[PDB]
Design a protein around this ligand. Sequence first.
Ligand SMILES: Nc1nc2c(ncn2[C@@H]2O[C@H](COP(=O)(O)OP(=O)(O)O)[C@@H](O)[C@H]2O)c(=O)[nH]1
Ligand SMILES: CN(C)CCCN1c2ccccc2Sc2ccccc21
Length: 169
Amino acid sequence: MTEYKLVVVGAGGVGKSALTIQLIQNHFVDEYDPTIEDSYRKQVVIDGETCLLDILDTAGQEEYSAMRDQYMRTGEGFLCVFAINNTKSFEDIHHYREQIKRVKDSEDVPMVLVGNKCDLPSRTVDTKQAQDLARSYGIPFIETSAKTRQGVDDAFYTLVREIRKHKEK
Ligand SMILES: Nc1nc2c(ncn2[C@@H]2O[C@H](COP(=O)(O)OP(=O)(O)O)[C@@H](O)[C@H]2O)c(=O)[nH]1
Ligand SMILES: CN(C)CCCN1c2ccccc2Sc2ccccc21
């Protein structure tokens, strides 16, 4: 069994802690503290390969920038989640990609763009806008919802393959 370290990044409220729990507990949580950081391990067999997923739900700001950059260097796959009804989070995805790339000092980093809250209206971020950004980074983009669980599993599954491609490259 191969172990995969994945970190979900985004703004406070995009639903990172919801997506992570949806894969672990298999149930949506309407109320959960965003500041509480917790990493979960899940044994899944994708593509015939049994892999243990180590997903960490970060809060945002760390006490020490040292450990902050550290948790960004140990991660092999990073899930970029934003809210389609919150352009503020989508625009922050720009600095998120930039930062992590500088932390690991690389050009090619296994990442996936995820647009959560697709079930909710007031869609400020259009699909094309996100796809355009993803296209620039050279990574896949998937619209999801932690409520109805649409594309949530697929997003994680895709990230795993993204990591693999970088490993066999
Ligand atoms: N309606 C809706 N709310 C969501 C969704 N995902 C997360 N939320 C809500 O976003 C708020 C914060 O969730 P939280 O677990 O803190 O996620 P995070 O802090 O963004 O990582 C809570 O009200 C969650 O129920 C979603 O997909 N749909
Ligand atoms: C403590 N270990 C059993 C889990 C560590 C998980 N971890 C994390 C997970 C995936 C990529 C990077 C990181 S760095 C980090 C930071 C805080 C807590 C746990 C971790």
